Amino acid sequence: RCLPSGKACAGVTQKIPCCGSCVRGKCS
């Protein structure tokens, strides 16, 4: 369920981290 870049990753305690790397509250 990793999030593909272009999304707002704002919840380190989420189900899945950024498929890539979440930076600046933005899946990069």
Is residue 15 within 8 A of residue 22, CB to CB? The reply is no
Long-range contacts of 1-6 (CB under 8 A, 24+ apart): 3/27
Whole-angstrom distance, CA of residue 9 vs CA of residue 20: 11
Q: How many CA atoms lie within 13 A of 14 on its CB side?
A: 15
Give 1-20 as a DSSP string: --B-SSS----TTSSS-BSS
How would you class 22 by CB atoms within 10 Å of its CB: exposed for 0-12, middle for 13-18, buried for 19 or more?
Answer: buried
Conformation bin of residue 6: beta by default, left when phi > 0, alpha when psi is -120 to 50: left
**Partners of residue 18 on adjacent β-strands:** 3
Q: Is the distance from CB of 10 to CB of 27 less than 8 angstroms?
A: no
